[PDB]
From a paper:
PTPN3 possesses three domains: an N-terminal FERM (band 4.1, ezrin, radixin, moesin) domain involved in localization to the cytoskeleton–membrane interface or interaction with transmembrane proteins, a central PDZ domain that mediates interaction with other proteins, and a C-terminal protein tyrosine phosphatase (PTP) domain bearing the catalytic activity. HBc protein (183 residues) presents an N-terminal capsid assembly domain (residues 1–149)2 and an arginine-rich RNA-binding C-terminal domain (CTD, residues 150–183), which is dispensable for capsid assembly in vitro but is required for viral genome replication in cells. Finally, the C-terminal residues of the CTD form a non-canonical class I PDZ-binding motif (PBM) with a C-terminal cysteine (–ESQCCOOH; class I PBMs are defined as –[X–S/T–X–Φ], where Φ is any hydrophobic amino acid and X is any amino acid). This PBM has been shown to interact with the PDZ (PSD-95, Dlg1, ZO-1) domain of protein tyrosine phosphatase non-receptor type 3 (PTPN3)5 and GIPC16.
Residue numbers in the entry:
A (entry chain B): 1 to 8
B (entry chain A): 505 to 597
Write the structure that this text describes.
């Protein structure tokens, strides 16, 4: 996927 | 115009800074803050991080040509540090 969202 | 803000964040007890990121050179979308978790370290430092902030530098590193997964690792790496502090230079509209 080119719409990744990651929690930091 | 747009402007740059330097933001310094120390992670919480779980090692989390309290923000989400989207983008990266593999995502064909600039690296950008997509969430600020209310009352997290990223929300309570001064100056604070804002949703929509464009990430320019991570601990001095220009990340314009790095992948999503790379920059997540760079952020996690700042916890294993001198001051445990993450320094984000961001661009704000
Ligand atoms: Br502020």
């Amino acid at each position: 996927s080119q719409s990744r969202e990651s929690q930091c | 115009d747009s402007y740059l803000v330097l933001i310094r964040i120390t992670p919480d007890e779980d090692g989390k800074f309290g923000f989400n990121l989207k983008g990266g050179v593999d995502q064909k979308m600039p690296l950008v803050v997509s969430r600020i978790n209310p009352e997290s370290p990223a929300d309570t430092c001064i100056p604070k991080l804002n949703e929509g902030d464009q990430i320019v530098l991570i601990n001095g590193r220009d990340i314009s040509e790095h992948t999503h997964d790379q920059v997540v690792m760079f952020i996690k790496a700042s916890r294993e540090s001198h001051s445990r502090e993450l320094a984000l230079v961001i661009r704000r509209r």
